[PDB]
Design brief:
- This is part of a larger assembly, with 2 copies of chain A, 1 copy of chain B (about 280 residues), 1 copy of chain C (about 150 residues), 1 copy of chain D (about 120 residues) and 1 copy of chain F (about 70 residues).
- Chain B is an alpha+beta fold and about 280 residues long.
- Chain B is built from 3 helices and 10 strands, in the order ββαβαβββββββα.
- Chain B has 2 domains: about 140 residues, RNA polymerase, RBP11-like subunit (Gyrase A, domain 2, 2-Layer Sandwich); about 130 residues, DNA-directed RNA polymerase, insert domain (RNA Polymerase Alpha Subunit, Chain A, domain 2), CATH 2.170.120.
- The longest helix of chain B has 28 residues.
- Chain C is an all-beta fold.
- Chain C has a single domain, classed as OB fold (Dihydrolipoamide Acetyltransferase, E2P) (Beta Barrel).
- Chain C is about 0% helix and about 40% strand.
- In chain C, strands 1-2-3-7-6-5-8-4 form an 8-stranded antiparallel beta barrel.
- Chain D has a single domain, classed as RNA polymerase, RBP11-like subunit (Gyrase A, domain 2, 2-Layer Sandwich), CATH 3.30.1360.10.
- The longest helix of chain D is centred in the last third of the chain and has 27 residues.
- The chains are: A mainly alpha (about 100), B alpha+beta (about 280), C mainly beta (about 150), D alpha+beta (about 120), F mainly alpha (about 70).
- Chains in contact: A-C, A-E, B-D, B-F, C-D, C-E, D-E.
- Chains B and D meet through strand 1, helix 1 and helix 3 of B and strand 1, helix 1 and helix 2 of D.
- Strand 5 of chain C pairs antiparallel with strand 4 of chain E.
- Bound molecules: zinc ion (2 copies).
- The site of one zinc ion has 7 residues of chain F, from helix 3.
- The site of one zinc ion has 5 residues of chain B, from loops.
- Chain C: GO terms for molecular function: DNA-directed RNA polymerase activity; single-stranded DNA binding.
- Chain C: It is found in: Nucleus; Nucleus, Nucleolus.
Chain lengths: ~100, ~280, ~150, ~120, ~150, ~70
């Protein structure tokens, strides 16, 4: 709910609020803050998410979020975090474009 | 081994029937295993083959055979020298592995006749009779004292059979129980919390729980371990109570020493090199 | 002697919060003598009868033998190495599963709360200078309670 | 008549050994004993004598099924002492306590009790 | 009556494969009756086991690792908690929060009140039971039961 | 059909105490005291005798004890 709330939680900001210049969470990604292409491609990603959010609102007019689907992506991420011994306070080591592509 | 404790015994009370005692400074597993031997492993003699010559009684034959097996038999003097049937070289039976009983009764009288344990006769010498009415001067002797009414007979009925009693132990059939019952109790004040009472005031105190005589009910101690087990072995009458205990321990010794011989047999035959 | 991760003398505020309770377990509510830390801990009240009003000394360490790993356990009664304080009155073994603190804004990382689990018996500790010793991975933590002071 | 003959509960069969020893494939100085035709009475007590010993790391028994007369005893000892000798000592010590118990009971009966015979 | 139908049965209709029914993607079969009551009673964290009983339970378990776990209480005398021995029973390392909805606590507003662990809610991590009590909602024919995740 | 030799629950022989019991009840209306004198302490041994029904007595009365 709330378009503003969706925007806040999902959008990957570039203006970087003075909260550790991308050097928080992410690691070397502070080096790709100057990239124009990466900015446009993610901005393209967010553009698909607003359109998907719009179609998905048409599919489920009632507003139920419970659907049957395979895998259960969230439990897998947890299996993934737990085994590799991922500390969520330590800084990241992942490139965003690697994720999108 | 240095960590084996000398337990200890005290006989509180002894009668012709009961034997009531306390075992102390030992393990529960010992107490429980020894209680189980008193039931199953102590051997005795009971009827095992019944051959029915004539039976005109109002009870069917297999019923007569059942009642008759279940009747008690003195064995103390003879249960030891007797050998087990299967082990004995003889085909069928013999004087050396079994003892023979004979019963013959007919109702020629107008009044109903009862068939009893005294009417059963041992072809074997009177070393091993039925439990009731023999050397007697017994204050337990009351009215008929037939020990068991095998059946009743009205004018005209008759009963002729043979029986062969054999040595065996309770694990194999209940007729071979050498006990009327076996009381077993440990830690009467529930110090060790093996049970957890909801509203402990609602429970009574046994004759062993008298210690604090008070009503404070169960003082706790977590550093304790089960000690001092109370027994009361009670004789069915077919084997006197102390003889039940001494034969139980010996049988348990025999069973254990035998397992040691087979375990030795593993190190002698097929040399223990597997592990 | 085991390398020390945390050490302090705590005083007991309460032994029965809300009151729901059980039996043979009790939930302690405590306050540290350095008054910069707070603590909640479940304890086996049946074998270690604690009481309100008295300051208890508590220490936490990830090791026993000298200063190195040993979590391979089966605990092994046969070890005779005096590396263990063993002089402590109550000892529990467990892992740390969850940690928490403000982690959003500028600086953030202000103070800290740690959640630990000793075999189902839970613990909650709050702090700040204990951040080097808290995790949301890594098992092997030992909780030692001793002396109950004077 | 699909019921087994009652003697079979305790009588040893001619094609079966009284005891069998097999090595564990997982951890060292562990052993597995199979005791045939012998229930909790022997098994529970041998488990306890093994637990009494201070050099036994692990001791236990399981009767796999009620209907099948057989128990297994698994024992694990320190990397110095062999599990077979521990088993040998466990019975022999048990033989010693029971003999002393029988002796002490008999002498206790020897007390001026007048219904001993 | 042939190897051919025996092969077909072993692969298609053999029971262990029949666990999660395609009717409503949940377990067709879970832990029922006494055992289910006995599991709740065993997992309460006031349950403590001394060396002798733990070894016997370890003994009844099949796929046991072979290593004996370190008791959650080292002194004065070794004790393992119930959760601890249940935690050897969980295969590999499955994971699930919640999957309790037990009577316990204060639905809708209690977990938001300090997370004073309250012990009610069940959490399992890397194949070890961290906290909580197991019931029909954890173990039963539930959509998210331990049993479903295990399959 | 006549009281069983030995009580089911435990084993204490009990057929021997039947004839004695009918005598005691004829003498006294004290079922409590009757069972006590016979020595039937615990109640399993007591239910045995207290709850028995001696059908045999009616059964014997047919003449043809001959077929
Ligand atoms: Zn013969
Ligand atoms: Zn009875």
């Amino acid at each position: 709910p709330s378009n503003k709330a969706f925007e806040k939680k999902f959008r990957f900001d570039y203006t970087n609020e003075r909260a550790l210049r991308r050097t928080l969470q992410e690691d070397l990604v502070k080096d790709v803050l100057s990239n124009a292409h990466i900015q446009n491609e993610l901005e393209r990603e967010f553009e698909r998410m607003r359109e998907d959010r719009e179609v998905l609102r048409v599919i489920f007019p009632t507003g139920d979020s419970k659907v049957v689907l395979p895998c259960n992506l969230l439990r897998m991420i947890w299996n993934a975090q737990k085994i590799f011994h991922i500390n969520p306070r330590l800084p990241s080591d992942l490139h965003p474009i690697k994720v999108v592509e | 081994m240095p960590y084996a404790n000398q337990p200890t015994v005290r006989i509180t009370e002894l009668t012709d029937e009961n034997v009531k005692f306390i075992i102390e400074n030992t393990d529960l597993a010992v107490a429980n295993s020894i209680r189980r031997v008193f039931i199953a492993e102590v051997p005795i003699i009971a009827i095992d083959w019944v051959q029915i010559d004539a039976n005109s009684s109002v009870l069917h034959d297999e019923f007569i055979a059942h009642r008759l097996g279940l009747i008690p038999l003195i064995s103390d003097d003879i249960v030891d020298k007797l050998q087990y049937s299967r082990d004995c070289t003889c085909e069928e039976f013999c004087p050396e592995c079994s003892v023979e009983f004979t019963l013959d009764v007919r109702c020629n009288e107008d009044q109903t006749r009862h068939v009893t344990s005294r009417d059963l006769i041992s072809n074997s010498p009177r070393v091993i009779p039925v439990t009731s009415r023999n050397r007697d001067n017994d204050p337990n002797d009351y009215v008929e004292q037939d020990d068991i009414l095998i059946v009743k007979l009205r004018k005209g009925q008759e009963l002729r059979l043979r029986a062969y009693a054999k040595k065996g132990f309770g694990k194999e059939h209940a007729k071979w129980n050498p006990t009327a019952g076996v009381a077993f109790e440990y830690d009467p004040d529930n110090a060790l919390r093996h049970t957890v009472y909801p509203k402990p005031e609602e429970w009574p105190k046994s004759e062993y729980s008298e210690l604090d005589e008070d009503e404070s009910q169960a003082p706790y101690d977590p550093n304790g371990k089960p000690e001092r087990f109370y027994y009361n072995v009670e004789s069915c009458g077919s084997l006197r109570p102390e003889t039940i205990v001494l034969s139980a321990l010996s049988g348990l010794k025999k069973k254990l020493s035998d397992l040691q011989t087979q375990l030795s047999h593993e190190i002698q035959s097929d040399v223990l090199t597997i592990n | 002697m085991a390398g020390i991760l945390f050490e302090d003398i705590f005083d007991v505020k309460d032994i029965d919060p809300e009151g729901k309770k059980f039996d043979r377990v009790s939930r302690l509510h405590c306050e540290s003598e350095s008054f910069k830390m707070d603590l909640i801990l479940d304890v086996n009240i049946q074998i270690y009868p604690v009481d309100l009003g008295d300051k208890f000394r508590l220490v936490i360490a990830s090791t026993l033998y000298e200063d190195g790993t040993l979590d391979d356990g089966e605990y092994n009664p046969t070890d005779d190495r005096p590396s263990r304080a063993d002089q402590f009155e109550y000892v529990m073994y467990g892992k740390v599963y969850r940690i928490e603190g403000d982690e959003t804004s500028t600086e953030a990382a202000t103070r800290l709360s740690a959640y630990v689990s000793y075999g189902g018996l839970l613990m909650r500790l709050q702090g700040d200078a204990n951040n080097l010793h808290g995790f949301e991975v890594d098992s092997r933590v030992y909780l030692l309670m001793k002396k109950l002071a004077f | 008549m699909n019921a087994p003959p009652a003697f079979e509960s305790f009588l040893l069969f001619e094609g079966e050994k009284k005891i069998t020893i097999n090595k564990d494939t997982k951890v060292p100085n562990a052993c597995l004993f199979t005791i045939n035709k012998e229930d909790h009475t022997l098994g529970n007590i041998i488990k306890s004598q093994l637990l009494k010993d201070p050099q036994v790391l692990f001791a236990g028994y399981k009767v796999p099924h009620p209907l099948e007369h057989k128990i297994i005893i698994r024992v694990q000892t320190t990397p110095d002492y062999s599990p077979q000798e521990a088993f040998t000592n466990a019975i022999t010590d048990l033989i010693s306590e029971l003999s002393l118990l029988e002796e002490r009971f008999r002498v206790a009966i020897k007390d001026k009790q007048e219904g001993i015979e | 009556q042939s190897l051919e139908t025996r092969a077909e049965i072993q692969e298609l209709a053999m029971v262990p494969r029949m666990i999660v029914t395609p009717q409503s993607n949940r377990p067709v079969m879970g832990i029922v009756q006494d055992t289910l009551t006995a599991v709740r009673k065993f997992t309460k964290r006031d349950v403590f086991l001394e060396r002798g009983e733990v070894m016997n339970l370890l003994m009844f378990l099949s796929t046991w690792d072979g290593k004996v776990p370190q008791p959650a209480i080292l002194k004065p005398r070794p004790l393992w908690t119930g959760k601890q021995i249940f935690s050897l029973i969980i295969p590999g390392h499955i994971n699930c929060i919640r999957t309790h909805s037990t009577h316990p606590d204060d639905e809708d507003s209690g977990p938001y009140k300090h997370i004073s662990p309250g012990d009610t809610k069940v959490v399992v991590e890397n194949g070890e039971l961290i906290m909580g009590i197991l019931c029909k909602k954890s173990l039963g024919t539930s959509a998210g039961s331990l049993v479903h995740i295990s399959y | 059909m006549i009281i069983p030799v030995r009580c089911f629950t435990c084993g204490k022989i009990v057929g021997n105490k039947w004839e004695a019991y009918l005598g005691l009840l004829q003498a006294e209306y004290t079922e409590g005291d009757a069972l006590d004198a016979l020595g039937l302490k615990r109640y399993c041994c007591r239910r045995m005798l207290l709850a028995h029904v001696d059908l045999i007595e009616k059964l014997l009365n047919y003449a043809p004890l001959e077929k």
